[PDB]
Amino acid sequence: GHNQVIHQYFDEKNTSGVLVIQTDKKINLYGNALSRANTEYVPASTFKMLNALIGLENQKTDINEIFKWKGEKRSFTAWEKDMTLGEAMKLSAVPVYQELARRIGLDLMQKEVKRIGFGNAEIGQQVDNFWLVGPLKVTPIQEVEFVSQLAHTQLPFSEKVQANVKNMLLLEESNGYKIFGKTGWAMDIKPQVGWLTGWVEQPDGKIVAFALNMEMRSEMPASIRNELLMKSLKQLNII
Ligand SMILES: *[C@H](O)[C@H](CO)[C@H]1C[C@H](S[C@H]2CN[C@@H](C(=O)N(C)C)C2)C(C(=O)O)=N1
């Protein structure tokens, strides 16, 4: 696990990103801009994990509720359907999670976020966008421990709610290993910030949490987050 090779991957994908790895409370940093680890960025779709948790915990929804698309034009055609909270998570389908947020309401959301202690724990006044254009901001270090805690079922929520949310996050299950995570991409701010926060379940049950953060750019493909992360984790011999 050479901190040089990984620098060269971020070097050569022309970006500015850091990869945070936490393995039972030791945090290692990789990339080409390690200073990113301690600066706050808007969380974007990575805040859906926390949004589900709050919603499920407060019984504003459940994993079987179907969210009806009422016909407004949305940003992707894949989002123009009825779907479950879990389907909306796989697609990062913002409008669904804005509905949920509006159900929670400002007060509940503000109390929950500051109770969890997530990022700056500031959501301002508009309860269905604070995680896309501020004011809510979080460092990649805080994100990896948040997701580390979730993987270990150690967040301040009931266990069944955390398990419900973990099951929406399954990204890939190959050769004995399991990968969980949530992509993010804040497109409507400068600079654009892209995320991929989650964890690896090693076949023996060891948990390795991770939080990819990079500066984003409109012409980049979606998979540049997965390509960067996959070959970084294979390098570190986490897979
Ligand atoms: C906010 O919309 C943001 C969450 O950070 C979205 C934008 C990108 S792109 C997203 C659109 N739908 C997914 C997909 O591949 N399709 C077309 C179903 C991907 C994003 C992300 O994936 O990080 N989340």
Numbering used by the authors: 35 to 273
What text does the study give?
Among them, the OXA-23-like carbapenemases are most widespread and have been detected in up to 83% of A. baumannii clinical isolates. In the class D enzymes, the acylation step requires activation of the catalytic serine by an adjacent lysine residue post-translationally modified by carboxylation; this same carboxylated lysine is also involved in activating a water molecule, which attacks the acyl bond during the deacylation step. Recent structural analyses have demonstrated that OXA carbapenemases have evolved the ability to hydrolyze carbapenem antibiotics by allowing ingress of the deacylating water to the active site.
The acylation of OXA-23 following addition of MA-1-206 was monitored at seven time points.
